[PDB]
Every structure is written in structure tokens, then in C-alpha cells.
């Protein structure tokens, strides 16, 4: 409704770096807000794409941003009669970023890893890895839970159980208020998908450079399965946290598995021990229900509601025809111990191949009326197909079925404007929460400032 579309702020990165693929707000010890942007195809030392992260200070004019430096050199450790190898070429550092406290977490989902032993090996596979940083103190650490030193032969003899060689840990990431990092690894357990969780404090204290394989006793990974309904579900394609069980001492997880049950798609809500509380199945095959998930209370009843994106949902149209437009589902949390029912609201896309619902961002209370609002991306929507972000306002009954505002892409075609969103933070400190929209296609980031309501 009251976002300012006339005077935007633009941040830009290197060409072809996909600057804007992922972003997030970041408050330092002094509460000064900055934007952290991921650029998964930024050039490394050997003029090879390794990815990179930028930490953009707030400035009404925007501009270029300083790099958040990380180690990009491949590592080798000959220990215990084995050779440990990390490969950072085309790892995609910055494929996702998340900020918690004064710490930044940037992930490289396709960082490869291998272990050699004489003529045998584990196999060079994308286990993924996360780089943690504390910009102010200069501290650095890493977390790579899916790494292992088991040789190929062993997996075959064990029928490929607990095979975490293709996790791609960091694909999606979230941090609980308590400070526990939660990484989604859609490739875990031979493409079933798994979650890895560990306290940030413990990730830092247990890490030392050069070790490559260290223990984090407090960590906790989800479980493998023999059920074909989970096969190639990419459980952990998207992740989020919230309160869905009444007990406030416990934190619940929300996991998207967009191809679960033979591409029917699904999203599940779990406890901290990965025990499933609820499961929401997709409405249509290949719609990619679960591509994105958002947790926020939109009807001001104090209870976190759930939003699920299905960017490829095909809508039924006259003469028995289907038009791929995308869809979002709203699930309002019921009073007390009860299961989430049917969707309370179905928001459906308009533009063909617009991919409405590819991203969903809680905005907080944008217009300051008492109900939280959200933003929904259609990276290839709009009459021009350049991208479009629609704002939906909260109300006592959930959400409004029609958008309060539509942000058309200021970039050229193919910018993927909206592929990443982030809101619910006052960046200019004007008392209204603001929105940052990524356009990795154009290697830029647009900042929309919320202003007092005109109407």
C-alpha cells in the first residue's frame, strides 16, 4: 500500500555475479541496519566463479558495496591415512544468506568434497558448506555437516542408506531466535532431503581452519527413510521457523518438499526433534507446492499463520485449458491444539509463466493498521513479463484477496525481479518497515521505503 515506488535505492554488483540472488537485513552491535547480499557467481582468485557476499551500508542513493571476505582456496588434509579435499569451484557462495544478531551466514550449496584412500574414494559430491562471519570482530567459522570420510564401496554394501554425499547443505537457511542455525539440504539421503541444525555459538567454538572434519556434538540432523513417498522430494528446498504447538519454550520448523510424493509436493511442520506435527499436501502435480514458505501472523490473533508458494500451479480456464500462473496458499493457525485445515485463502497468479508465489516475504505491519502484511513475487509476471511484486494486507479474516499495491520491475527483461524478497525491517528508521527486492538477473538490488499512508 504505502511503499514508495517513485524514489527507490539501487545497489549493484559485478556483472554476471548474480548479485541479488539472496539478501537479508543485518543489524550490528549498535543496531545500525545494513543489507547483506549474496552473489553466487562472483569471480574468485583463479578467475573462476566461486560466489561472494557483500555487506551494503544503508545510503539513500545506494551504489556499490564492499565484499564480506571469505576463504576461497581449495583445501587438502592428509590425515588418518586418508586425503580430505574441498573444492570451491562453482560452489555458489551466497546462494543463500541469513543474518542473526551480529552474525552473517552465507552458504555455498554446491561446494564439492571428496576423500581419497589409496585407489578408493568417497566420490566428489556437492555436500555444501556454510560460512559464518562476525563483521565487526572479524571472526570467521564454517559448518559443513554433510561431510564424511566413508568410502564409496561402503555405501554400496549398505544399500546407500544415510548417504549424505549430495546434501547441498545451505540450499536454504534459517536461524531461530535462540541462535540455532537450520540448514536445508534437498539432496540429503540420496535426494530425499534432510535438515541440519546446530547452535551458532557451537559452530564457532568448535571450528578451526585446516581440520575439515570436526565434531559439533550439539548438532542435529533429520532422518533417512525407506518410504518411496519421500524419494526425490527435495525435503529442505525451503525452510522457515515459527510457533505452531502452543508451547513457547519449543521452536517448530517448516520444511518445503516441492517434489514430495511423486511431484505432488508438500510442506511439513516439525518440532525441534524432527517429529512431524502437520503435513500439507500439494494441490497439483509439478506445481512445485513448497517452493517457498513463509511464517507470519496475518490476522492479529497472536498465532503464526502459514503461507505456501506453488509458482508453477496451472489454473483452470475456459474450454478445458490450463494456464501456468502460480499460486499461494494461506493457512491460519486454529485456536489451541488443532490441525491446520483447508487453505483459508487461495491467491492465484494472472500472468502466464509469471511464476506467482516464487517468493513470499512477511512485511510486518506496513500500513500500521494492526495486521501484518506480506509481499508475493512473480519474477516473470506483469504485462511486460519483467517481474512484479504484489503486496497483500492483513485483516481479521486473514488476508485481502486483492493486492493493496503492485511494484513493477525497474529493471530490464530477465532480471528475475522478485526472485528474492525481505521485509519487516525499518532500514531508514522512519518508523515504517521496508522492503528489499533482489534481481540477480540484473545483478542489482532495489530498496523500497515505506512512507506514511496517503489515503
Amino acid at each position: 500500500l504505502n511503499l514508495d515506488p517513485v524514489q527507490l535505492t539501487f545497489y549493484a554488483g559485478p556483472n554476471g555475479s548474480q548479485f541479488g540472488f539472496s539478501l537479508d537485513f543485518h543489524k550490528d552491535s549498535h543496531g545500525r541496519v545494513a543489507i547483506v547480499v549474496g552473489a553466487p557467481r562472483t569471480l574468485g582468485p583463479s578467475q573462476e566463479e566461486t560466489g561472494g557476499v557483500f555487506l551494503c551500508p544503508w545510503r539513500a542513493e545506494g551504489g556499490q558495496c564492499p565484499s564480506l571476505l571469505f576463504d576461497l582456496r581449495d583445501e587438502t588434509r592428509n590425515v588418518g591415512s586418508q586425503t580430505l579435499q574441498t573444492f570451491k569451484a562453482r560452489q555458489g557462495l551466497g546462494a543463500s544468506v541469513v543474518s542473526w544478531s551480529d552474525v552473517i551466514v552465507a552458504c555455498a550449496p554446491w561446494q564439492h568434497w571428496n576423500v581419497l584412500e589409496k585407489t578408493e574414494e568417497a566420490e566428489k559430491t556437492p555436500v555444501g558448506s556454510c560460512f559464518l562471519a562476525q563483521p565487526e570482530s572479524g571472526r570467521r567459522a564454517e559448518y559443513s555437516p554433510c561431510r564424511g570420510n566413508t568410502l564409496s564401496r561402503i555405501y554400496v554394501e549398505n544399500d546407500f542408506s544415510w548417504d549424505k554425499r549430495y546434501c547441498e547443505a545451505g540450499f536454504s537457511s534459517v536461524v531461530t531466535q535462540a541462535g540455532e542455525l537450520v540448514l536445508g539440504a534437498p539432496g540429503g539421503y540420496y535426494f530425499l532431503g534432510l535438515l541440519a541444525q546446530a547452535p551458532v555459538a557451537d559452530i564457532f567454538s568448535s571450528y578451526r581452519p585446516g581440520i575439515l572434519l570436526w565434531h559439533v556434538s550439539s548438532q542435529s540432523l533429520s532422518f533417512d527413510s525407506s518410504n518411496p513417498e519421500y524419494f526425490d522430494g527435495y525435503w529442505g528446498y525451503s525452510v522457515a521457523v515459527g510457533e505452531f504447538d502452543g508451547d513457547l519454550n519449543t521452536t517448530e520448523y517448516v520444511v518445503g518438499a516441492p517434489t514430495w510424493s511423486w511431484t505432488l509436493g508438500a510442506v511439513e511442520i516439525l518440532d525441534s526433534y524432527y517429529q512431524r506435527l502437520h503435513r500439507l499436501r500439494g494441490e497439483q502435480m509439478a506445481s512445485y507446492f513448497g517452493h517457498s514458505v513463509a511464517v507470519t501472523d496475518v490476522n492479529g490473533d497472536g498465532r503464526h499463520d502459514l503461507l505456501v508458494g506453488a509458482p508453477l500451479y496451472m489454473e483452470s480456464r475456459a474450454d478445458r485449458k490450463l494456464a501456468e500462473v502460480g499460486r499461494v496458499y494461506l493457512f491460519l493457525q486454529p485456536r489451541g491444539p488443532h490441525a491446520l485445515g483447508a487453505p483459508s485463502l487461495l491467491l492465484t497468479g494472472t500472468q502466464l509463466y509469471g511464476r506467482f508465489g516464487s517468493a513470499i516475504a512477511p512485511l510486518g505491519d506496513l500500513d500500521r493498521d494492526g495486521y501484518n502484511d506480506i509481499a508475493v513475487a512473480a519474477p516473470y509476471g506483469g504485462p511486460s513479463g519483467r517481474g512484479q511484486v504484489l503486496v497483500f494486507l492483513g485483516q481479521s479474516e486473514g488476508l485481502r484477496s486483492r493486492p493493496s499495491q503492485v511494484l513493477d520491475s525497474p529493471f530490464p527483461t530477465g532480471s528475475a525481479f522478485g526472485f528474492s524478497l525481505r521485509g519487516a525491517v525499518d532500514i531508514d528508521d522512519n518508523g515504517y518497515p521496508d522492503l528489499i527486492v533482489g534481481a540477480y538477473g540484473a545483478n542489482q538490488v532495489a530498496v523500497y521505503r515505506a512512507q506514511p499512508v496517503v489515503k
Partner: antibody
Amino acid sequence: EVQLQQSGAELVKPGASVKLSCTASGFNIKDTYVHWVKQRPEQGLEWIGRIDPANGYTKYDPKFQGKATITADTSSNTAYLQLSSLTSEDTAVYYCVRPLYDYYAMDYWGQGTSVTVSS
Amino acid sequence: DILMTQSPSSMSVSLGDTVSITCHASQGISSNIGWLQQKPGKSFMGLIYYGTNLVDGVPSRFSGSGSGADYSLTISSLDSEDFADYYCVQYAQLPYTFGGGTKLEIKR
């Protein structure tokens, strides 16, 4: 807190077979590797072997192959070291060890177990 | 098997002294070394792992250094408890191997 409670001192006769234990306290034995080390006054420290309690795979120094057999039961959260066809040279103090962070390191040690072989 | 020549076998020193034990391997071990301490009539304690990294709880007066096949544990400002046996261990190759050991004795 990580603690390795090893079994009480053993006293057996030559040719017998003893089985030592190393129960984990404050953590799941299944977490890390578990090594066994032998100490003698004159010969010093000698690595016997290790085991991964999660899957049960083991590794031995070819000096102990046949003599020593390392096992582990995740249920009782304990790791064992059995020695057969004992002799006077087997009279030594045995320690169970596990790493802190580094997968391959040897940081935490049990109190030890005194073994004596005599008729 | 990698041989660990640890010297000196023993040394007599006083409190506050800065002493250094050394370890030598039959071949390179890329900082894959660990230092241990065994107080008289007691079990072992971890000091250093992977060359230089202190085990949680160990005072900062301890420090591991060196590379290749030659490494050293250094104790700055000796304390009354520091008088005990110290061993080095390599885990670059199996089987793991230990050093001869070094007993710190009180001088007088």
C-alpha cells in the same frame, strides 16, 4: 561433561581372556571414534586400534591383530576391548580415548584400567 | 609406521621457566600432531591438537608450534602442576604412534 568410565582393575592368569569396557558419560558413545591405547613403564604408549560405534567398523595396529578385539554397544553406551591368549607382556594399563573436535585427534582419555597376568 | 623421536627424555627446571619440548617424525605429518600430559599417578589430559590448537580448558601458557617433521610444545612460566610426563602423538598415518615421552622434574 565428557567422561569415560573404564572398568575396574583386572587380574587374570596366562592363557585367559579378559574384556575391558569404557562407558561414555555425558555424551553418546556413537558420536565419535573410540581408540584403545596400551601403556607400559618401559615400552611406553602403543596404539592398539579404534572403532566407530555407529557402524562398528574397526582398525588395528598389525601388532595386535588377533590379540585385541574392539567392539561397542550403542545401547549400553559402552565400548569394549577384549584380549585373548594373555601373557606376561600383556600386563599393562589400557586407556580408551576419543577426539574433542578434530575427527582424528586424541583429546579425551578414560581413567585407565590396570591389567595383570600372573599364575 | 611413523617413528616419533621425542627429546629430551627429561629435564630439570624451576618455576617460572619457559621450557620447550621437541618432537621429530620419520617423515612429514602436516601438523597432524597432538600433545598429551600425564600427571604422576593419574590419567592423561589433552593439551594440543592439530599442531597448535589448545584443547578446551588448557591454559594459554601452553602452545604448540612447528611444521613438516619437527614440532615443539612450549610452556611459558612453569607452574607447580606442570611438572609431569608429556607425550606427543601423530595421527597423520595409521597406526597412530607416540613419542618416547618427557618428564619435567624440579631442579635444586
